[PDB]
């Protein structure tokens, strides 16, 4: 993909591929609340990194128009305000307030850098994507069981991670404090680059942590012991040794000198820890420190946060921010995600059904199913 080719393709996509009808269905939420779509904030990033916010639109036609006119490189969705953002200058000071917004989570592979060995920075590979695969299951289950949020849209971020939009009416009316509470409840791996032991579970395992460890276990052997090989050599297993009390460290080292496979080393570590009881949760702390999602509480706490819009185009990879089907999560491949160049090649190879002829169709289908569920909830209620 040639990023110099981005300015050539962006218009066509925004003209014949961007799913505006479903997009308006989403952000309009069945028209129940008046001025809901009209008070939504958008922000655009144009060529040469020119940023504009407090953009609002009257209806789908105005949005389609101004978007096709601007051809933005980035589209971010923001809060629904007390008035129309376009007229925020006209609103008396203090009377312009963000009132409702989806509850959103951003999980970014870059935040896992201190604990992955295959890639670094913005590089991803099939060996590390399983971490995202774990996160979506660990988090989404909580959101479906502990909090009872029923309408959850998971979206690929385009490069390094995934976003989650929780769109239940209750989740859209949550205050800042309630959002911060939700984020802290879901958050376990606490600390920066200056801390080595980032998980310190108490004697009692809270049911949520038990279910997160249960989800982790299913994948741990493949991710950590086979793929990541977190015990390949001394430079790496020294870390895991650094994560357990010194008392057994020596006892482990000799054992790790006689083990040929990291699965064997894990068995040995588990046996040694079991023999050594307050430390019976130490293996769980290691698993969490290598597998549990990291959440930027600043992303989810603030109501006025602008997050990458679904079906955006990644300025560098060119991939489309496509929704991820929860059931088919295990089959999701971030490298097969349609790029803008591929879908423009597909478009120029054959009115409201043009996208069905591209590789974008199944993802718009997943989005349509999610919107159908939202409509059913709006009606039934």
């Amino acid at each position: 993909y040639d990023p110099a080719s981005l300015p050539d393709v962006l218009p066509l996509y925004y003209r014949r591929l961007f799913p505006f009808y479903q997009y308006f269905r989403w952000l309009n939420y069945g028209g129940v609340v008046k001025n809901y779509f009209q008070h939504r904030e958008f922000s655009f990033t144009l060529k040469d990194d020119v940023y504009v916010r407090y953009q609002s639109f009257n209806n789908q036609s105005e949005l389609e128009k101004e978007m096709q006119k601007m051809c933005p490189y980035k589209i971010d969705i923001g809060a629904v305000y007390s008035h129309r953002p376009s007229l925020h200058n006209t609103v008396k000071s203090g009377t312009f307030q963000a009132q409702e917004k989806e509850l959103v989570f951003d999980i970014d592979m870059t935040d896992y850098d201190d604990v992955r060995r295959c890639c670094s920075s913005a590089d991803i590979c099939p060996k590390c994507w399983t971490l995202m695969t774990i996160a979506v299951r660990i988090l989404d289950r909580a959101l479906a069981e502990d909090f009872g949020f029923k309408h959850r849209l998971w979206v690929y971020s385009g490069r390094r991670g995934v976003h989650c939009w929780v769109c239940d009416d209750s989740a859209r009316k949550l205050s800042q404090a309630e959002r911060s509470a939700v984020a802290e409840y879901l958050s376990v791996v606490k600390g920066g680059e200056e801390t080595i032991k980032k998980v310190q579970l108490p004697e009692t395992i809270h049911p949520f942590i038990g279910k997160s460890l249960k989800m982790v276990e299913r994948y741990f052997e493949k991710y950590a012991l086979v793929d990541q090989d977190i015990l390949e050599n001394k430079q790496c297993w020294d870390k895991v040794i650094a994560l357990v009390p010194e008392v057994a460290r020596e006892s482990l080292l000799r054992e790790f000198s006689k083990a040929r496979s990291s699965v064997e080393r894990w068995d040995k570590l588990s046996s040694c820890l079991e023999a050594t009881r307050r430390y019976s949760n130490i293996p769980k702390e290691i698993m969490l420190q290598f597998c549990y999602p990291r959440l930027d509480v600043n992303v989810s706490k603030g109501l006025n946060h602008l997050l990458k819009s679904p079906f955006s185009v990644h300025p560098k990879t060119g991939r489309i921010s496509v929704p991820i089907d929860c059931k088919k999560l295990d089959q999701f491949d971030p490298f097969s995600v349609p790029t803008i160049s591929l879908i423009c090649s597909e478009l120029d190879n054959v009115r409201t059904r043009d996208y069905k002829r591209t590789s974008l169709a199944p993802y718009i289908k997943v989005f349509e199913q999610f919107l159908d569920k939202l409509d059913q909830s709006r009606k039934g209620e």
Binding site: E178, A181, Y185, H206, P207, G210
Partner: protein, 128 residues
């Protein structure tokens, strides 16, 4: 008024407390015994320092998680389907919040209905 209310709440036995919470449609739980057995292990691991038999001797309440922020935030109460299961100090705070809201509204309305009372000389020397 808030102070007085707090004191009185502080003097309420758990039974009486629940009665109050019901009569005003505050609906802070009360879980059934069958549901309690259904989530026995989860409840046991949720409440800190709760023994098996002692837990069998206790009854929880179901509250929307938006009211248990201070409990949920450090993960000291189980959440299931948007409701926290809170055992039998902080609750008074929530009750008081509700009370205060209501009372403020009421005072506003009363200040709006003042002209009707000023004409009653009998009650003017007192109230004014």
């Amino acid at each position: 008024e808030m102070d007085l209310f707090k004191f009185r709440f502080g003097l309420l036995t758990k039974e009486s407390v629940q009665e109050f919470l019901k009569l005003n449609d505050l609906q802070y739980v009360a879980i059934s015994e069958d549901e309690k057995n259904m989530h026995k292990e989860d409840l046991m691991n949720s409440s800190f320092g709760l023994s098996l038999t002692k837990m069998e001797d206790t009854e929880f309440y179901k509250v929307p998680f938006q009211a248990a922020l201070d409990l949920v935030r450090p993960r000291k109460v189980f959440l299931w389907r948007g409701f926290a299961f809170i055992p039998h100090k902080d609750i008074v705070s929530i009750v008081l919040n509700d009370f205060r809201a209501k009372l403020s509204k009421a005072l506003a309305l009363s200040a709006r209905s003042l002209p009707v009372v000023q004409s009653d000389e009998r009650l003017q020397p007192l109230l004014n």
